[PDB]
Amino acid sequence: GATGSVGGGKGSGVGISTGGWVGGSYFTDSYVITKNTRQFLVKIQNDHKYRTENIIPS
Amino acid sequence: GATGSVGGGKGSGVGISTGGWVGGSYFTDSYVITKNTRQFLVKIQNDHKYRTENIIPSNAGGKSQRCVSTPWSYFNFNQYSSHFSPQDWQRLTNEYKRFKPRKMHVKIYNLQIKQILSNGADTTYNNDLTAGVHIFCDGEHAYPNATHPWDEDVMPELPYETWYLFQYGYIPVIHELAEMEDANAVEKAIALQIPFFMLENSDHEVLRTGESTEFTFDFDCEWINNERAYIPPGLMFNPKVPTRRAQYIRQHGNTASSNTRIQPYAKPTSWMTGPGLLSAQRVGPAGSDTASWMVVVNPDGTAVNSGMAGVGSGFDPPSGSLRPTDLEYKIQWYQTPEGTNSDGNIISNPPLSMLRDQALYRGNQTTYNLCSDVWMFPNQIWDRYPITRENPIWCKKPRSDKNTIIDPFDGTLAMDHPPGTIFIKMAKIPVPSNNNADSYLNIYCTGQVSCEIVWEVERYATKNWRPERRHTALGLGIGGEENINPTYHVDKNGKYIQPTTWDMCYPIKTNINKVL
Amino acid sequence: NAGGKSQRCVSTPWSYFNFNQYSSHFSPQDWQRLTNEYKRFKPRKMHVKIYNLQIKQILSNGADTTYNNDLTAGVHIFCDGEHAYPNATHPWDEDVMPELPYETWYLFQYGYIPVIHELAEMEDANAVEKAIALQIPFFMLENSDHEVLRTGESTEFTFDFDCEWINNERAYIPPGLMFNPKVPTRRAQYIRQHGNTASSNTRIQPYAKPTSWMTGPGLLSAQRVGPAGSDTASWMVVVNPDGTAVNSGMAGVGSGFDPPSGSLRPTDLEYKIQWYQTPEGTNSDGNIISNPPLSMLRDQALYRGNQTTYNLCSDVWMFPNQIWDRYPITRENPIWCKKPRSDKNTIIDPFDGTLAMDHPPGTIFIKMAKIPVPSNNNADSYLNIYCTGQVSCEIVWEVER
Amino acid sequence: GATGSVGGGKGSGVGISTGGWVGGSYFTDSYVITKNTRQFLVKIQNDHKYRTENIIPSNAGGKSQRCVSTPWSYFNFNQYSSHFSPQDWQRLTNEYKRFKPRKMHVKIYNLQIKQILSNGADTTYNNDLTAGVHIFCDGEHAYPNATHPWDEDVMPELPYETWYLFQYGYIPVIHELAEMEDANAVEKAIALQIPFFMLENSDHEVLRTGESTEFTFDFDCEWINNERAYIPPGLMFNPKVPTRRAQYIRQHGNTASSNTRIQPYAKPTSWMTGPGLLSAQRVGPAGSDTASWMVVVNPDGTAVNSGMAGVGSGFDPPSGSLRPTDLEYKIQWYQTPEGTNSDGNIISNPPLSMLRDQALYRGNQTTYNLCSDVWMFPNQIWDRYPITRENPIWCKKPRSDKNTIIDPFDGTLAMDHPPGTIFIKMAKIPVPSNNNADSYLNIYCTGQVSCEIVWEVERYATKNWRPERRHTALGLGIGGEENINPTYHVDKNGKYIQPTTWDMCYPIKTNINKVL
Structure with a gap:
């Protein structure tokens, strides 16, 4: 941020973060920039397999 | 080392x-x-x-x-x-x-x-x-401020105590408006305008355990003056030197009209008492917001029936540089969060500086009467509130078009941009839930925070012959579980003994004399 | 008790x-x-x-x-190298670096005495005791900078001793015996007349030659007092600022000074340095009592002629031309002592044999980070942890053959 | 300016x-x-x-x-x-x-x-x-010294008081020898050796009214220490740490012989009480020289029958760093030359430094008894006498072959060459006399004398958490003709109000703590 300094090293590791939160918008005449960060969750889908099935209707 | x-x-x-x-x-x-x-x-x-x-x-x-x-x-x-x-x-x-x-x-x-x-x-x-x-860190104060002077859970006085950060929150609305009695159009318009702030709307740094961060801030500040006045500005003259000035006394019933030279010890002053509001008195129960002087904002819609003790903020100390008439006008606080019922409270006292406890008296042509409200007036001269070690340093000065002299009566330094508040939060770590819900990993963070202030100071030089008042450990008290422990020390349970009086807190504007 | x-x-x-x-x-x-x-x-x-x-x-x-x-x-x-805090260590203290290298070292808690407690007791209302109490200093080690180490980090410390020598040589004769018994002397002596012995003025015998060199100082007079539990020493060094009639059974008020004897021959076992080899030592089991080295600068005495016999005068104070040797130190002695800061001092020769110096090696203080855990109720609860590490000490000793 | x-x-x-x-x-x-x-x-x-x-x-x-x-x-x-x-x-x-x-x-x-x-x-x-x-100026101390510590007619404390120089004089003889009872050969030999000193035996400068003179001196001095000890050197250890040392108790009648480990709070010290002489008591009337301890020199000739109170100088304070048993062992003085009969006298008090009031007690194997005379002994450690603003700065250290540690018990700095004394005299102006006589012109001299001392100082730094004692004007008293005037001020007659207690004189070794 303003006059901020991160003391994490340049080397990657388990205890080093790979980035930081970005957010907010910036308006000019010619362009607008939107910045958005989300925390996502990925879990196991479909029991690790491909299946071809008919969707049951109502 | x-x-x-x-x-x-x-x-x-x-x-x-x-x-x-x-x-x-x-x-x-x-x-x-x-x-x-x-x-x-x-x-x-x-x-x-x-x-x-x-x-x-x-x-x-x-x-x-x-x-x-x-x-x-x-x-x-x-x-x-x-x-x-x-x-x-x-x-x-x-x-x-x-x-x-x-x-x-x-x-x-x-x-x-x-x-x-x-x-x-x-x-x-x-x-x-x-x-x-x-x-x-919010350095531009783009969000509402996290801190307010005299707030609890400030950085621990003793270095070995853990600091347990408080949740951040802010007041979006005046709630007497947010109550929305029946249907009022202006209250509806106030409500539709209520701002909402997420800290996620900006960029922040994410740290894992091997990372650290640093922040720097430059204060642009006015000085905090430690010197005292030994006389009022009204007393600086020579009582043996005659004056050219004359005075006229209107004729009273038993006292004739007279025009005479002013006495050499009676010489008049051009310098006014500082401002302050002595009149009002506190109202209502302790639970409600209660102050003698209540600062409110009513945009529309109300007959102001609300028992407005809560509608406004309340303004104290009102007194400024006037001598407080009652304890109600004095700044008092507690040393610990467990302080209650005049146990552990410290009441501010006069520094014995002659710019501090002031009054106007209005001649009714028999006696003098104290006029409570001294407003701002030309040629007023006063000193700032004497601050102890327990005072807050600064205050956020609110953004506005116009303001008068900035001299907060609690002694804090009020500035457009104080040091920006550092907001800290742990990453929000979701865990899978088969049922639809939001469940998170239960975690906590501990770290070290170091603060380094550079303070600009200036030493005094005096032509005074005599010794001056200084703060000494001999003004401190004894307390503890066995009552053998001095102030600012620890007892056998590890309890830190606290100053029990305002002098034990070592206020400024006590020790060092200045010649007006 | x-x-x-x-x-x-x-x-x-x-x-x-x-x-x-x-x-x-x-x-x-x-x-x-x-x-x-x-x-x-x-x-x-x-x-x-x-x-x-x-x-x-x-x-x-x-x-x-x-x-x-x-x-x-x-x-x-x-590390406190400037001795800005109170000293952690005192000579002859337990829990020193293990004699054998394969024993674990279990560091002791640090603590210090802020007050003389007979003052801290504050009987009734005394103004000077009140003034002593308001002046009691308080020291936190957190008031300074220290280094924080995780498991992959290490730290090092260096110290240069400026020391006087520890002398290993012995004297086979006293300084009073260095002369030739067959060489006559020019000196004469006068004997006052006793009742049965007439006055006489005669030449000093060639084996009787007089010496210019005095017995070293020491205090033999006093005797220990009171029960073992109380502080007990023959000679008690106290400081009384004010306020007392010194009724306190001052065995505890003062520190006590022993060995008092210096280079005088100890009259009693009470005047001898004795210690235990292990912390389990008790009741004259495992204790080692110091003995005369058989150096002729060590067990010394003055005798005062009463013109019939000679009597031992217990207190030999500091006197010109005194010559003696330092206490003989074994492998179990402490090496150094902190010499207290003061305006004035006499010759520094601690009677336990330690080297007393303004700045000894600074003590290294070690503490684990204080790791709080959240508590829903208001309290202070911490993570229960301990640290083990290796510490290596390397001394360079200057020697002479 | x-x-x-x-x-x-x-x-x-x-x-x-x-x-x-x-x-x-x-x-x-x-x-x-x-x-x-x-x-x-x-x-x-x-x-x-x-x-x-x-x-x-x-x-x-x-x-x-x-x-x-x-x-x-x-x-x-x-x-x-x-x-x-x-x-x-x-x-x-x-x-x-x-x-x-x-x-x-x-x-x-x-x-x-x-x-x-x-x-x-x-x-x-x-x-x-x-x-x-x-x-x-006698810079080499070729003549007898003019000044002695605690002497009157020293440079006026307040700058606007006139200084009226005292006549110079010196003691050539021990007068009990100069008395020359009957015929004694050694007293005759002492008398023939009595030196005589004229200041005219040297070069001096003669000034008329348009002339001035200057003098410079470089001090080579040991420091005057302002710090205090909060504990004795005997108390520096940890009471919870066990000791290796063992002690042996001789068998008393009702107490058996025992050999035991020293208690962790009882740990023995290697550091001795400082020296001092408590035994002797003052003798004789006030008019005669009276001190408990009398330092004399008798070359020969006497049976010392003289009531030797006057023959010797007398040595006080004898006590050194031992706690004075009586007021007789304390340094006391008067603030003004008109001081008499315990009116205007200031008695020295303990600084409350733990290197200052000291004692030895000698175990008789029942109780402890105070042994009055503590001579010089190895491993003695003490502090110098705490000096106030009214103390003399230096003393002339007498030329001799041998001396012990130089620590004057009045707190002065004793040195081989102090600042040389400046002797001043008017020219001796004869007037003619027809009869044979010596008649002189009656004249006097007034001038300005300026003294500039450079003092080398050092500030303190401490790790102490708590506040420390300081000297403050609030320890001062009120006095005067109307009894409204504080110490170090003037009353309506121009009289300068004097400190009435030893604390009002602000001694050293009070305020600043040191870690032993």
Whole structure:
């Protein structure tokens, strides 16, 4: 941020973060920039397999 | 330290520390440096969500602020006891006639995020090495301010106490408007305009355990004056020198009209008493907001029937540089959060500076009567409130078009941009839930925070022949469990003994004389 | 059980290392070779390294106890080289660096005496005791900078001794015996007339030659007082600022001064330095009593002629032309002592044989990071952890054959 | 002064001043400078001749010193109140842990010799423009010393008081020898050896009214320590740490022999009580020389029947760093020359430093008994006598072959060469007399004397958390003719109010703590 300094090293590791939160918008005449960060969750889908099935209707 | 060598490598990692403990003060003629390190704890606030709720008041008739509560926590450095030991504060107020903060450096480092595992009654803790902590400084004051003077949970006075950050929150609305009685169009328009602030709307830094961050701030500040006046500005003249001025006395019933030369000891002054409001008196129960003078904003819609003790903020101390008539007009606080019922409270006293306890008296042509309200008037001269080590340092000065002289009556330095508040939050770590819900990993963060203030100081020189008042340990008291322990010491239970009087807190504008 | 004699201390969360003793730095082999082959030695430089650190969390599941590494936990390490704080160590203290290298060292808590407690007792209302109390200093080690180490970090310390020599040589004769018994002397003596012995003026005998060199100082007179539990020493060094009629049974008010004897021959076992070899030593089992080295500068006496016999005068104060030797030190003696800061002092020759210096090696203070855990109720609860590491001490000793 | 310009010419003359008034102090970190100017008066002493006479004693049995009195006068700068205001002394003892004198500069200037004309009851004064004044500094101490510590007529404490120099004189003999009872050969040999000193035996400078003189001196001094000990050296250890040491208790009648480990709170010390002599008691009437301990020199000839109270000098304070048992062992003085009968006297008190009031107790194997005489012994450690602003600064250390540690018990700095005394005398102006006689012109000299001391100082730094004792004006008293006037101030008659207690004089070794 303003006059901020991160003391994490340049080397990657388990205890080093790979980035930081970005957010907010910036308006000019010619362009607008939107910045958005989300925390996502990925879990196991479909029991690790491909299946071809008919969707049951109502 | 002296001839010390650390054998940790330059590369960052899980097993490398990101800094070391700093502590102590350093005194020079031009500046003083205070170094302070604390161990802090950050935990999950507000169940990871933003909420807007009314604060429930006490048994008193309901007076409620509506706040937005956030998942975020913040650091609050604003107080002198946090940056100065009682030793260092004594030396500051004895040896220097003025001081101000110059630059500030904050470092957050040696961070640990641990998962909280509940097996049962027993609780276990495991490092989450990949968990991040979100740290953000608002230097432009783009969000509402986190801190308010005289607030609790400020950086611990003693360096070995843990700091447990408070949840961040702000008041979006005037709640008497948010109540929305029946259908009122202006209250509807106030409500549709209520702002909402998420800290996620900006960029912040995410730190894992091997990372650290630093912050720097430059104060642009007016001086805090430590000198006292031994006479009023009305007394500076020579009583043996005659004056050219004449006075006229209107004829009373038993006293004839007369025109005479002013007495050499009676010489008139051009310098007015400072402003202050002595008139009003406190109202209502303790639970409700109660102050003699109530500052309100009513946009529309009300007949002001509300028992407006809660509608306004309340203004105290009202008195300024006037001598407080009652204890109600005095700044008083508690030394510890457990302070209650005039136990542990410290009441401010007159510094015995002649710019401080002031009055106007209005001649009714028989006697003199005290006129309570002294408004701002030309040629007024006064001194700022004498501040002890327990006072807050600064206040956020609100953005506005117009303002009068800025001299907060609690003694804080009011500025457009104070040091920006550092907001800290742990990463919000979801865990899968088969049922639809939001469940999160239960974690907490501990780290070290170091604050380094550079204070600009100036020594005094006097032509006074006689010795002057100084702060001494002999004005301190004894307390404890066995009642053998002096102030600012610890007892057999580890309890820190607290100053029981306002003098034990070593106020300014006591020791050092100035010639007007 | 003795009548209450109590010091008031400040106890700290900190621990310290104590290197002060010879058995810690010398094997019995190395000590033997030192004292056989060298006439003097002194410490020259000291190097300490703290490394291979492990912080482990202590987990109580139940009767069983498990240990897990905390990889991000730091340990706080601080050296006080300027002696800005009170000293951690005192000579002859226990829990010094283990004599044998394979024994674990378990650091003791640091603490200091802020007050004279007979003053801190504050009987009734006394103004001077009130003034003493308001002046009691308080020291936190957190008031300074210290280094924080995680498990992959290490630290090092260096110290240069400026020391006087420790002399290993003995005297085979007193300084009073150095002359030739067959050479006549020019000196004459006069004997006052006794009742049955006439006045006479005669030449001094060639074997009787007089000496210019005095017995060293020492205090033989006083005797120990009171029960074992109370502080008891023949000679009691006290400081009374004001306020007391000194009724206190001052055995506890003062520190007590022993050995008092200096280079005088101890009259009683009470005047001898004795210690125990192990912390389990009790009741004259495992105790070692110091003996005369059989050096002629060591067991000394004055006798005062009453013109019939000679009587031993117990107190020999400091006097010109006194000559003596320092207390003979074994491998179990402490090496140095902190010499207290003061305006004025006499000759510094501690009677226990330690080297007293303005700045000894600074004490290294060690503490684990204080790791809080959240508590829903308001309290202070901390993570239960401990640190193990390796500490290496390297002394360079200057010797002379 | 500030942007000031003197229009007096560079050439010296009757109408040109040889200097200007200097005053005030200047504080830095490394040094302090004191500047003092006084107006002095020199008049004719001893009728222009050297005389050797016995001093007449009081109603007490005759005890008499034989002195040589001289026509000369001298300046005496030795005291702190002369160079420091009460303000400056307070600041010195609060802000600095040690100080010593560094260099000294004296200037004698603006001299006026006036003839005293007696017409009758009226007395007139006329300038003698050609009259000289003789000024001499003895820097090598070739003559006997003029000054002795605690002497009166030292440079006035307040700068506006006139200084009236005292006649110089010295003791050539021990007078009990000079008495020469009957015929004694050794007393005859002592008498034939009595030295005689004229100041005229050396070179001195002669000044007329347009002349001035300057003197410089460099102190080589040990420090004066302002710090205090909060514990004895016997208490520095940890009461919870066990000790290896064992003790043996001899069997008493009802107490069996035992050999046990020393208690962790009982740990023995290697550090001895400082020396002092408590035994002796004062003797005889007040008029005679009376001290508990009497230092004499008897070369021969006497059976010492003389009531030797007068033969010796007397040694006090005898006590050193031992706690004084009686008031007889305490240093006490009077603030003014008019002080009498415990009115205006200040008695020294314990500084409450733990290196100061000390004792030995000797176990008799039942109780402890105080042994009065503590001689010099190895491993003794103590502090110097705490000095107030009224103490003399230095003492002349006598030339001798051998000496022990130099620690004068009054706190003065004893040195081989102190600042040399400046002797001043007017020219001896004869007038013709027809009858044979010696008649002289009656004249007196007034001038300005300025003394500038550079003091080397050092500030303190502490790790102590708590506030420390400081000297404050609130420890001062009120006095005067109307009893409304504080200490170190003047009353309506111009009388300067004096400290009535030893604390009001601000001793050292009180405020600043040191860790042993």
